[PDB]
Amino acid sequence: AYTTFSQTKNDQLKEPMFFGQPVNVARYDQQKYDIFEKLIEKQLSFFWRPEEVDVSRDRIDYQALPEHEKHIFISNLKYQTLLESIQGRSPNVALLPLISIPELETWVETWAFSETIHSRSYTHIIRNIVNDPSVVFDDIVTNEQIQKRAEGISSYYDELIEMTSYWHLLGEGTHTVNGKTVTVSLRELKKKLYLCLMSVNALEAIRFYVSFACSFAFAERELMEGNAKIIRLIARDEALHLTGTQHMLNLLRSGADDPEMAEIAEECKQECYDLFVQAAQQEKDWADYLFRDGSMIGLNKDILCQYVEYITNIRMQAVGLDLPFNTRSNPIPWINTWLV
Amino acid sequence: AYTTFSQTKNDQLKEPMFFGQPVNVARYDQQKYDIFEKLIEKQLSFFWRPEEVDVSRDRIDYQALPEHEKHIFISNLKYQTLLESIQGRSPNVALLPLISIPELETWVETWAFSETIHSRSYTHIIRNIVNDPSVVFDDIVTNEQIQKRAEGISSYYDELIEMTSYWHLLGEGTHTVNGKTVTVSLRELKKKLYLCLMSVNALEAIRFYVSFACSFAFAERELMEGNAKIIRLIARDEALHLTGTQHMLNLLRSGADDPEMAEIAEECKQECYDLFVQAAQQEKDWADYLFRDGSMIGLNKDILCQYVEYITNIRMQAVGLDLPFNTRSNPIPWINTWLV
Ligand SMILES: [Fe+3]
Ligand SMILES: [Fe+3]
Ligand SMILES: [Fe+3]
Ligand SMILES: [Fe+3]
Ligand SMILES: [Hg+2]
Ligand SMILES: [Hg+2]
Ligand SMILES: [Hg+2]
Ligand SMILES: [Hg+2]
Ligand SMILES: [Hg+2]
Ligand SMILES: [Hg+2]
Ligand SMILES: [Hg+2]
């Protein structure tokens, strides 16, 4: 039931963010939610190209690095790479088919485009510090260590995409497919989207900020500056992305866009709380692999874990959830000079 | 049966362009087909922002235009806006789920992204020349003459998107759904893909160039110069887009990438020919509507129809189809001043 161009003339200012009539005309002179247009404008003003950044000295720095420090750096790089690979394609495949207002549709495509730039920035870095990228990229797919901290991400997406297909093909109701009953409920599909968005918010607001900490730690000891410039640029974009998800979630919760959503959100309550708790726990567990062969002066499992708790409470509070960790001060205040 | 991150370790250099294992890692250090990486790089170096273009004198230019010329300029602008709205979302929703090589996946997202900048530019022009933009945007969806093309284009995308869902959900074979038999054939799905591709090739290779001629006809008279600067940037991007689909089609029909597709394209060869000739005929009928109230300096239904046949012959030959019209030279060589 999906269409690339709905022939019905509708007031786009009256459609909900999701599940309404598919967007037909792309206009930007007006918007139901001005914030998405502001995010497109900001992101476009930040346009950058990784190839231009000078990472020529990073090879000398990396080579001089002690083995366990090479391990920490390259492992952080492999994870960032896997997350961006998924973020480059997923927002378009999972959200585009469900969006019903123009500014949000375009923001999703701009956001996803920026992710492919990040992925491209990692190839730029890898190529300039290793003799063969092929070894780095192949290890990403294998090595359960990586897949372990990331387990569940592709899960939330894949499930949303499949239920969305059944909905477009069969419509709401109970059906018979090859002799088996299949139920299609819009209420359950709306729940699937909210949970997905929450997982994405956790990915960009928490999982990525933990990785930045590891990157900037090297920058503090005046090493890997080429990588550092790029990470600052990526972090500047990520702040825009997390703002977008925070607004999507809070607007859906308010009930002003779709009352049924506010009702479902109250039911999603414990589930979204738990997925944030699970993500936080996965980041900590990943620390065990990062510091397998040893840690660094100002960075170790303990400090990283404190930062995970510190940032998770901040992110969860921003979307109205209760805080799972003890309140604390920033454990690595030096990172502030690198962000913003 | 689609996944945002396939857990199987595969050689991305040995996968077909389409219908293979879904892309897992996003890397840009190598590629099966260099053309797509080349295209991503060129498109990125061309980055521009419509806001930067001064269109402050276009308002007075438009008001002073005779009645029939306003009709021409605005009808053309609305058709362009229509196609751009479709091209900004469709390649993503229709192709991403079927691609199996990383360079092609990112090119498609980069391509789609560039189209949303084109949509943004038309909003920039429209509100700088009409006072009440809503009137323009609403006519785009309901205009009977314009829609005499919207459904045909949308139909090719929609049918491919629907069959793709059945294939991903049920797989090949004879199934039953709510008392009805439903057959799923990969061979038929392959044919559907070859068709959106031929259709989109005709769209960017022919439909858009016919509209460029009209825009630059005004620029040759020193009118609507802000509009002209923007169409020049747009046309520069389109040359890259059509290069992309031309390569996809030739790789699929030669048999180099997928023997089966080559066998399929050979059997539906007459259908592909009729499809291209049908697109040229619609552009001819349009020129008719465009000049129903009179012509202007440098353009008329006859000169325009001659350009359609000239450009159509060139594009069809590029993808292996016989020429439908008589060969001739370029009817309007002055257009090269604004193109390539
Ligand atoms: Fe990113
Ligand atoms: Fe992001
Ligand atoms: Fe375009
Ligand atoms: Fe295009
Ligand atoms: Hg999501
Ligand atoms: Hg998700
Ligand atoms: Hg860290
Ligand atoms: Hg198509
Ligand atoms: Hg025209
Ligand atoms: Hg024309
Ligand atoms: Hg064909």
CATH number at residue B268: 1.10.620.20
Under an 8 A CB cutoff, do A25 and B81 touch?
yes
Under an 8 A CB cutoff, do B9 and A44 touch?
no
Point out the residue among A4, A86, A166 whose CB comes nearest to the CB of B86. Answer: A4
- Identify whether A122 is a catalytic site residue: yes
Place of tokens 């006072």: B131
The secondary structure of residue B205, as a DSSP letter, is: I
Closest C-alpha to A104, from A37, A155, A54, A179: A37
What's CA B310's distance to the chain center, in Å?
19
Under an 8 A CB cutoff, do B161 and A106 touch?
no
Q: Which B-chain residues 220-279 have CB contacts (< 8 A) with chain A?
A: none
For residues A291-315, one letter each, b for 16 or more C-beta atoms within 10 angstroms of the residue's C-beta and e for the rest, the string is beeebbeebeeebbbbbbbbbbbeb
- A103/B contact by beta carbon, under 8 A: no
Q: How far is A26 from chain B (nearest CA, A)?
A: 5
Point out the residue among B81, B134, B177 whose CB comes nearest to the CB of A177. Answer: B177
Distances (CA, A) of A276 to A153, A270, A271, B6, B254: 12, 10, 9, 24, 50
Technique used: X-ray
Q: Of the ligands numbered here, which is closest to the C-alpha atom of A159?
A: 6
The secondary structure of residue B337, as a DSSP letter, is: G
> CA-CA-CA-CA torsion for A73, B8, A120, B256, nearest 10 degrees?
150
CA–CA separation, B126 vs A29, rounded Å?
Answer: 9
Q: Which amino acid is at A59?
A: R
A chain contacts of residue B178, beta-carbon cutoff 8 Å = 170, 175-176
Neighbours of A135 (CB within 10 A): 11
Cβ neighbours for A310, distance < 8 A, ≥ 6 positions apart: A325, A328, A329, A330, A331
Could you tell me the two tokens for A211? 């990785």
How many angstroms does the Cα of residue A194 sit away from the middle of ligand 7?
28
CA–CA separation, A53 vs A210, rounded Å?
Answer: 23
- A46/B contact by beta carbon, under 8 A: no
Under an 8 A CB cutoff, do A178 and B175 touch?
yes
How many angstroms does the Cα of residue A279 sit away from the middle of ligand 7?
15
Could you tell me the two tokens for A45? 């003003």
Cβ neighbours for B281, distance < 8 A, ≥ 6 positions apart: none
- B165/A contact by beta carbon, under 8 A: yes
Point out the residue among A3, A29, A177 whose CB comes nearest to the CB of B127. Answer: A29
CA–CA separation, B146 vs B131, rounded Å?
Answer: 23
Specified resolution (Å): 2.0
User: Of B33, B79, B122, B209, which residue is the catalytic one?
Assistant: B122
Nearest CA in chain A to B156: A4
Residue A123 domain boundaries: 1-340
How many angstroms does the Cα of residue A39 sit away from the middle of ligand 11?
42
CA–CA separation, A205 vs A246, rounded Å?
Answer: 10
A chain contacts of residue B27, beta-carbon cutoff 8 Å = 123, 133, 137
**Polymer length in residues for chain A:** 340
Distances (CA, A) of B155 to A2, A46, B193: 11, 37, 12
Closest C-alpha to B309, from B327, B291, B334: B327
Point out the residue among B28, B85, B89 whose CB comes nearest to the CB of A123. Answer: B28
How many angstroms does the Cα of residue B117 sit away from the middle of ligand 4?
11
Closest C-alpha to B194, from B148, B258, B150: B258
CA–CA separation, A83 vs A77, rounded Å?
Answer: 10
Sign for the pseudo-dihedral over CA of B176, A159, A40, A47: negative
The 3-state DSSP composition of chain B as helix, strand, coil percent (nearest 5) reads 70, 5, 30
**Polymer length in residues for chain B:** 340
Q: At B186, which helix (H) or strand (E)? A: helix B186-202
B299: left (phi over 0), alpha (psi -120 to 50) or beta: beta
Q: Which A-chain residues 48-87 have CB contacts (< 8 A) with chain B?
A: 49, 81-82, 84-86
Closest C-alpha to B8, from A49, A141, A89: A141
Q: Of the ligands numbered here, which is closest to the C-alpha atom of A234?
A: 1
A267 by Cβ neighbours in 10 Å (0-12 / 13-18 / 19+) ranks as exposed
CA–CA separation, B53 vs B221, rounded Å?
Answer: 19
For ligand 8, a single-atom ion, the residues with CB < 5 A are B 156-157, 196, 199-200
How many structural domains are present in chain A? 1
For ligand 3, a single-atom ion, the residues with CB < 5 A are B 115, 118
- A38/B contact by beta carbon, under 8 A: no
How many angstroms does the Cα of residue B221 sit away from the middle of ligand 10?
15
CA–CA separation, B47 vs A181, rounded Å?
Answer: 51
Point out the residue among B24, B141, B165 whose CB comes nearest to the CB of A24. Answer: B141
Q: Could you tell me which residues are beta bridge partners of residue B183?
A: B174
3-state secondary structure chain A: CCCCCCCCCCCCCCCCCECCCCCCCCCCCCCCCHHHHHHHHHHHHCCCCHHHCCCCCHHHHHHHCCHHHHHHHHHHHHHHHHHHHHHHHHHHHHHHHHECCHHHHHHHHHHHHHHHHHHHHHHHHHHCCCCCHHHHHHHHHCCHHHHHHHCCHHHHHHHHHHHHHHHHHHCCEEEEECCEEEEECHHHHHHHHHHHHHHHHHHHHHHHHHHHHHHHHHHHCCCCHHHHHHHHHHHHHHHHHHHHHHHHHHHHHHCCCCHHHHHHHHHHHHHHHHHHHHHHHHHHHHHHHHCCCCCECCECHHHHHHHHHHHHHHHHHHCCCCCCCCCCCCCCHHHHHCCC
